[PDB]
Amino acid sequence: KLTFKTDLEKLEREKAAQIGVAIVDPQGEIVAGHRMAQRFAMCSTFKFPLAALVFERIDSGTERGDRKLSYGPDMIVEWSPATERFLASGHMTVLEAAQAAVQLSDNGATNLLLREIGGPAAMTQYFRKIGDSVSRLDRKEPEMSDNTPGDLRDTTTPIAMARTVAKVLYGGALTSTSTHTIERWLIGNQTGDATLRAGFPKDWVVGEKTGTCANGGRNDIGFFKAQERDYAVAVYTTAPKLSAVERDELVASVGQVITQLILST
16 A cells, blocks of 8 residues: 555656546545545546436436437537437437446437436536535536646546445445446446456456546546455546557556555455
8 A cells, every 4th residue: 555655656657647546435435545636537437427317317207217318410429339320210218328328438328418417517416416526527528528738627536536436336326226227337338348447356346437538538437346345446547648558558557556455455
């Protein structure tokens, strides 16, 4: 954990990167952190809290999972693989869109959900509702992923986001059924094979949501269960000089550093 700190600092120095990490227990108590209260662009990681918001609405009855959301080609933006496939049919359901947002990082599907829930202002309100006074969504995709240096729009901190993850997965933010559904979606995420979970032991149960932003942002948030011990984790990195593959490797390396800490107990 001094090794944790110094191993992360070594990665930072050698990769010309900044690494923000928070690990918390199911009740949000701090296990470890590095630059844990530095703001970083959320990028696509917000799609996980967005899905949680959607499930809260399903749980309350203010939304219905199989409700059909109609759209045209205007909703197709960069990286909308599922939305493009469903375009001719003319709709995606609330649940289809949410699953695509989480597991494919589909931007069109994300924006479709934003259209339905009240836009960035409503996403921010949900963060506040679940005790997160830090995370903020200001824009839709892909512009929210601009990550202009210094911009506080569309940011979170590792500790705020890790606590948000814990509240959603362990802190009773959702019904047991909705919690299980979102957990399984995270485990089945299609975009994270080379990032955090690549650095964790293969018997840990891991689910996560990645992000990639301009100006070198590469992020991964979620949970892991090391045997019987449950943790929430948020990793945000900025590495402008690395290639895309090297950024993946950086996050996997952070996964290893996390593992080394966790295994020591």
